[PDB]
Write a protein that binds this DNA or RNA. Structure first.
Ligand SMILES: [Zn+2]
Length: 241
DNA sequence: CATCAAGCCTTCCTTCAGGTGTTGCTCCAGAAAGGGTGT
Protein backbone atom coordinates (compact mmCIF):
# COMPACT_ATOMS: atom_id res chain seq x y z
CA UNK A 1 0.00 0.00 0.00
CA UNK A 2 3.10 2.18 0.17
CA UNK A 3 3.57 2.52 -3.60
CA UNK A 4 0.92 2.63 -6.39
CA UNK A 5 2.41 -0.55 -7.89
CA UNK A 6 1.13 -2.38 -4.77
CA UNK A 7 -2.20 -2.55 -6.64
CA UNK A 8 -0.50 -5.30 -8.66
CA UNK A 9 0.47 -7.77 -5.90
CA UNK A 10 -1.74 -6.93 -2.86
CA UNK A 11 -4.81 -6.15 -5.08
CA UNK A 12 -5.48 -7.26 -8.73
CA UNK A 13 -3.08 -10.15 -7.89
CA UNK A 14 -0.60 -11.04 -10.68
CA UNK A 15 3.00 -12.22 -10.97
CA UNK A 16 5.98 -11.33 -13.13
CA UNK A 17 5.88 -12.22 -16.82
CA UNK A 18 9.20 -14.14 -16.36
CA UNK A 19 10.83 -12.67 -19.48
CA UNK A 20 12.16 -10.03 -17.12
CA UNK A 21 15.71 -9.57 -15.91
CA UNK A 22 16.91 -9.80 -12.31
CA UNK A 23 18.32 -6.58 -10.87
CA UNK A 24 22.02 -6.40 -10.01
CA UNK A 25 24.34 -3.87 -8.44
CA UNK A 26 23.24 -0.92 -6.35
CA UNK A 27 19.49 -0.48 -5.99
CA UNK A 28 17.67 2.05 -8.16
CA UNK A 29 14.07 3.19 -8.04
CA UNK A 30 11.75 2.19 -10.86
CA UNK A 31 11.14 4.77 -13.56
CA UNK A 32 7.36 4.28 -13.26
CA UNK A 33 6.59 2.76 -9.84
CA UNK A 34 8.90 5.06 -7.79
CA UNK A 35 9.55 1.73 -5.94
CA UNK A 36 13.19 0.79 -5.32
CA UNK A 37 14.20 -2.15 -7.50
CA UNK A 38 16.35 -4.06 -5.02
CA UNK A 39 18.70 -6.91 -5.83
CA UNK A 40 16.78 -10.08 -6.63
CA UNK A 41 13.71 -8.13 -7.77
CA UNK A 42 12.37 -8.72 -11.27
CA UNK A 43 12.76 -5.79 -13.66
CA UNK A 44 12.68 -4.96 -17.36
CA UNK A 45 14.83 -2.61 -19.41
CA UNK A 46 12.56 0.27 -20.32
CA UNK A 47 11.16 -0.70 -23.72
CA UNK A 48 8.62 2.14 -23.89
CA UNK A 49 7.63 2.95 -27.44
CA UNK A 50 7.71 6.46 -28.84
CA UNK A 51 3.96 6.92 -28.18
CA UNK A 52 4.66 7.07 -24.42
CA UNK A 53 4.08 10.73 -23.54
CA UNK A 54 4.39 10.47 -19.73
CA UNK A 55 8.13 11.16 -19.41
CA UNK A 56 7.33 14.20 -17.23
CA UNK A 57 5.76 11.96 -14.59
CA UNK A 58 8.54 9.36 -14.60
CA UNK A 59 9.94 9.00 -11.10
CA UNK A 60 13.56 8.27 -12.01
CA UNK A 61 15.92 8.12 -14.97
CA UNK A 62 16.99 4.54 -14.20
CA UNK A 63 15.43 3.19 -17.47
CA UNK A 64 14.35 0.18 -15.41
CA UNK A 65 10.66 -0.69 -15.14
CA UNK A 66 9.73 -2.88 -12.19
CA UNK A 67 7.62 -5.96 -12.91
CA UNK A 68 4.71 -4.47 -10.96
CA UNK A 69 4.81 -1.49 -13.30
CA UNK A 70 5.07 -3.86 -16.26
CA UNK A 71 1.71 -5.23 -15.10
CA UNK A 72 0.60 -1.62 -14.52
CA UNK A 73 1.59 -0.70 -18.09
CA UNK A 74 -0.55 -3.46 -19.59
CA UNK A 75 -3.23 -2.02 -21.88
CA UNK A 76 -6.11 -3.98 -20.19
CA UNK A 77 -4.83 -2.54 -16.91
CA UNK A 78 -4.62 0.86 -18.62
CA UNK A 79 -8.16 1.13 -19.98
CA UNK A 80 -9.63 -0.98 -17.16
CA UNK A 81 -8.64 1.76 -14.70
CA UNK A 82 -9.83 4.74 -16.76
CA UNK A 83 -12.07 5.64 -13.79
CA UNK A 84 -11.23 3.59 -10.71
CA UNK A 85 -10.47 3.65 -7.01
CA UNK A 86 -8.30 0.79 -5.78
CA UNK A 87 -8.93 -0.03 -2.14
CA UNK A 88 -7.26 -2.87 -0.24
CA UNK A 89 -10.14 -5.26 -0.96
CA UNK A 90 -10.81 -4.55 -4.63
CA UNK A 91 -11.11 -2.11 -7.51
CA UNK A 92 -14.25 0.02 -7.83
CA UNK A 93 -15.37 2.25 -10.68
CA UNK A 94 -15.96 5.99 -10.42
CA UNK A 95 -17.35 6.57 -13.92
CA UNK A 96 -20.81 7.47 -12.61
CA UNK A 97 -21.33 10.69 -10.67
CA UNK A 98 -22.97 8.82 -7.78
CA UNK A 99 -19.73 6.82 -7.57
CA UNK A 100 -17.71 10.04 -7.39
CA UNK A 101 -20.16 11.23 -4.73
CA UNK A 102 -19.28 8.12 -2.73
CA UNK A 103 -15.59 8.67 -3.44
CA UNK A 104 -15.51 12.32 -2.42
CA UNK A 105 -18.17 12.21 0.31
CA UNK A 106 -17.80 9.45 2.94
CA UNK A 107 -14.86 7.69 1.20
CA UNK A 108 -13.71 4.16 2.09
CA UNK A 109 -11.23 4.02 4.98
CA UNK A 110 -8.63 1.91 3.14
CA UNK A 111 -5.33 3.28 1.80
CA UNK A 112 -6.97 3.54 -1.62
CA UNK A 113 -5.72 4.97 -4.92
CA UNK A 114 -7.81 7.19 -7.22
CA UNK A 115 -7.09 7.15 -10.96
CA UNK A 116 -9.25 8.88 -13.59
CA UNK A 117 -8.83 9.55 -17.30
CA UNK A 118 -9.20 12.89 -19.07
CA UNK A 119 -8.99 10.99 -22.37
CA UNK A 120 -9.53 7.56 -23.91
CA UNK A 121 -6.48 5.87 -22.38
CA UNK A 122 -3.46 7.27 -20.54
CA UNK A 123 -0.52 5.89 -18.57
CA UNK A 124 -2.33 6.78 -15.43
CA UNK A 125 -1.87 4.58 -12.38
CA UNK A 126 1.86 4.45 -11.66
CA UNK A 127 2.44 8.22 -11.51
CA UNK A 128 0.06 8.90 -8.66
CA UNK A 129 0.67 8.42 -4.93
CA UNK A 130 -1.43 6.29 -2.60
CA UNK A 131 -3.92 8.08 -0.33
CA UNK A 132 -2.97 6.76 3.11
CA UNK A 133 -5.30 9.08 5.03
CA UNK A 134 -8.97 9.38 4.15
CA UNK A 135 -9.11 13.17 4.45
CA UNK A 136 -6.47 13.87 1.76
CA UNK A 137 -6.99 12.07 -1.55
CA UNK A 138 -4.36 12.03 -4.31
CA UNK A 139 -6.43 11.85 -7.51
CA UNK A 140 -4.75 11.46 -10.87
CA UNK A 141 -6.71 13.11 -13.69
CA UNK A 142 -5.18 12.94 -17.15
CA UNK A 143 -1.88 14.80 -17.18
CA UNK A 144 -2.35 16.42 -13.75
CA UNK A 145 -2.14 15.36 -10.12
CA UNK A 146 -5.00 16.56 -7.94
CA UNK A 147 -5.64 16.77 -4.20
CA UNK A 148 -9.19 16.40 -2.84
CA UNK A 149 -10.36 16.90 0.75
CA UNK A 150 -13.66 15.06 1.45
CA UNK A 151 -14.64 17.28 4.41
CA UNK A 152 -14.21 20.51 2.43
CA UNK A 153 -16.16 18.76 -0.36
CA UNK A 154 -19.05 18.13 2.06
CA UNK A 155 -18.81 21.74 3.28
CA UNK A 156 -19.11 23.00 -0.31
CA UNK A 157 -22.04 20.62 -0.84
CA UNK A 158 -23.74 21.87 2.33
CA UNK A 159 -23.34 25.46 1.12
CA UNK A 160 -24.61 24.59 -2.37
CA UNK A 161 -27.62 22.72 -0.98
CA UNK A 162 -28.34 25.50 1.52
CA UNK A 163 -28.33 28.30 -1.06
CA UNK A 164 -30.89 26.40 -3.18
CA UNK A 165 -33.45 25.64 -0.47
CA UNK A 166 -36.91 26.88 -1.39
CA UNK A 167 -36.01 27.45 -5.06
CA UNK A 168 -37.81 25.49 -7.77
CA UNK A 169 -34.92 25.79 -10.24
CA UNK A 170 -31.55 24.53 -9.01
CA UNK A 171 -28.93 27.21 -9.70
CA UNK A 172 -25.23 26.59 -9.19
CA UNK A 173 -23.14 29.09 -7.22
CA UNK A 174 -19.90 28.43 -9.11
CA UNK A 175 -19.34 26.78 -12.48
CA UNK A 176 -16.85 23.91 -12.45
CA UNK A 177 -15.66 22.09 -15.59
CA UNK A 178 -15.66 18.28 -15.67
CA UNK A 179 -12.74 18.33 -18.09
CA UNK A 180 -11.07 20.98 -15.84
CA UNK A 181 -10.35 22.72 -19.14
CA UNK A 182 -12.54 25.82 -19.46
CA UNK A 183 -11.28 29.25 -18.47
CA UNK A 184 -14.34 29.61 -16.26
CA UNK A 185 -13.45 26.48 -14.28
CA UNK A 186 -13.44 28.08 -10.86
CA UNK A 187 -15.24 31.25 -11.98
CA UNK A 188 -18.21 31.99 -9.73
CA UNK A 189 -21.56 32.60 -11.41
CA UNK A 190 -23.49 35.87 -11.13
CA UNK A 191 -26.27 34.07 -9.27
CA UNK A 192 -23.57 32.74 -6.96
CA UNK A 193 -21.97 36.18 -6.81
CA UNK A 194 -25.30 37.74 -5.84
CA UNK A 195 -26.15 34.91 -3.43
CA UNK A 196 -22.98 33.68 -1.66
CA UNK A 197 -21.28 35.68 1.07
CA UNK A 198 -17.76 36.97 0.40
CA UNK A 199 -16.38 34.54 2.99
CA UNK A 200 -18.04 31.72 1.04
CA UNK A 201 -16.75 33.09 -2.28
CA UNK A 202 -13.24 33.09 -0.82
CA UNK A 203 -13.95 29.58 0.51
CA UNK A 204 -14.90 28.34 -2.97
CA UNK A 205 -11.78 30.07 -4.26
CA UNK A 206 -9.66 28.52 -1.49
CA UNK A 207 -10.35 24.90 -2.47
CA UNK A 208 -7.74 22.96 -4.43
CA UNK A 209 -8.22 22.56 -8.21
CA UNK A 210 -8.77 18.85 -7.68
CA UNK A 211 -11.66 19.75 -5.42
CA UNK A 212 -13.02 22.06 -8.13
CA UNK A 213 -12.72 19.19 -10.63
CA UNK A 214 -14.47 16.82 -8.20
CA UNK A 215 -17.22 19.32 -7.44
CA UNK A 216 -17.79 19.54 -11.20
CA UNK A 217 -18.89 15.92 -11.11
CA UNK A 218 -20.92 16.72 -7.99
CA UNK A 219 -22.38 20.26 -8.38
CA UNK A 220 -24.81 19.41 -11.17
CA UNK A 221 -28.57 19.91 -10.87
CA UNK A 222 -29.61 16.26 -10.37
CA UNK A 223 -27.61 16.00 -7.10
CA UNK A 224 -25.93 12.59 -6.67
CA UNK A 225 -26.55 10.55 -3.55
CA UNK A 226 -23.24 8.83 -2.57
CA UNK A 227 -23.46 5.27 -3.91
CA UNK A 228 -20.61 2.76 -4.12
CA UNK A 229 -19.39 1.81 -7.57
CA UNK A 230 -19.73 -1.83 -8.56
CA UNK A 231 -16.63 -3.91 -7.92
CA UNK A 232 -14.67 -4.28 -11.15
CA UNK A 233 -11.56 -6.12 -9.93
CA UNK A 234 -12.97 -9.41 -11.22
CA UNK A 235 -13.62 -7.68 -14.56
CA UNK A 236 -10.13 -6.24 -14.94
CA UNK A 237 -8.57 -9.46 -13.62
CA UNK A 238 -10.46 -11.37 -16.33
CA UNK A 239 -9.40 -8.77 -18.91
CA UNK A 240 -5.80 -9.09 -17.68
CA UNK A 241 -5.95 -12.90 -17.50
C1' DC B 1 -22.89 119.04 -56.14
C1' DA B 2 -25.14 117.04 -50.86
C1' DT B 3 -29.92 114.08 -48.50
C1' DC B 4 -34.13 110.98 -49.68
C1' DA B 5 -36.05 106.87 -49.52
C1' DA B 6 -31.77 103.45 -47.73
C1' DG B 7 -38.56 97.32 -47.35
C1' DC B 8 -42.94 95.67 -46.01
C1' DC B 9 -45.20 90.04 -45.40
C1' DT B 10 -45.67 85.25 -45.40
C1' DT B 11 -44.43 81.36 -46.57
C1' DC B 12 -40.85 79.16 -42.62
C1' DC B 13 -43.49 70.89 -45.86
C1' DT B 14 -46.48 67.06 -47.03
C1' DT B 15 -46.37 60.67 -46.72
C1' DC B 16 -44.61 56.37 -46.46
C1' DA B 17 -41.43 53.31 -46.75
C1' DG B 18 -39.30 53.12 -40.71
C1' DG B 19 -35.93 45.01 -44.37
C1' DT B 20 -36.03 40.35 -45.67
C1' DG B 21 -33.06 35.00 -45.37
C1' DT B 22 -29.16 32.60 -43.82
C1' DT B 23 -25.74 31.34 -41.34
C1' DG B 24 -26.91 29.71 -35.62
C1' DC B 25 -18.82 25.12 -36.71
C1' DT B 26 -15.89 21.22 -37.93
C1' DC B 27 -11.90 17.95 -35.25
C1' DC B 28 -8.42 16.50 -32.27
C1' DA B 29 -5.55 16.47 -28.78
C1' DG B 30 -4.36 7.53 -26.91
C1' DA B 31 -1.07 4.53 -26.78
C1' DA B 32 -0.32 -0.35 -26.24
C1' DA B 33 -0.46 -4.71 -29.15
C1' DG B 34 -0.29 -7.24 -32.84
C1' DG B 35 1.36 -7.55 -37.16
C1' DG B 36 4.75 -6.10 -40.69
C1' DT B 37 9.77 -4.49 -42.87
C1' DG B 38 14.24 -2.15 -43.32
C1' DT B 39 18.57 -1.17 -41.91
ZN1 LIG C 1 8.19 0.93 -10.76
Amino acid sequence: MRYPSDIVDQVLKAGPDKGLLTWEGVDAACSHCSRPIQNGDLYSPSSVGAFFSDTRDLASTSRSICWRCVVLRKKPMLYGLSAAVVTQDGIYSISKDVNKAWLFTTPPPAPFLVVHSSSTMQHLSWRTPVTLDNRRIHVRYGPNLFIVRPEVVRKALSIADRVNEGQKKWVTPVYFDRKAAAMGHGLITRAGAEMLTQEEQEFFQSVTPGERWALSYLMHSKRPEPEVGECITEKVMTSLN
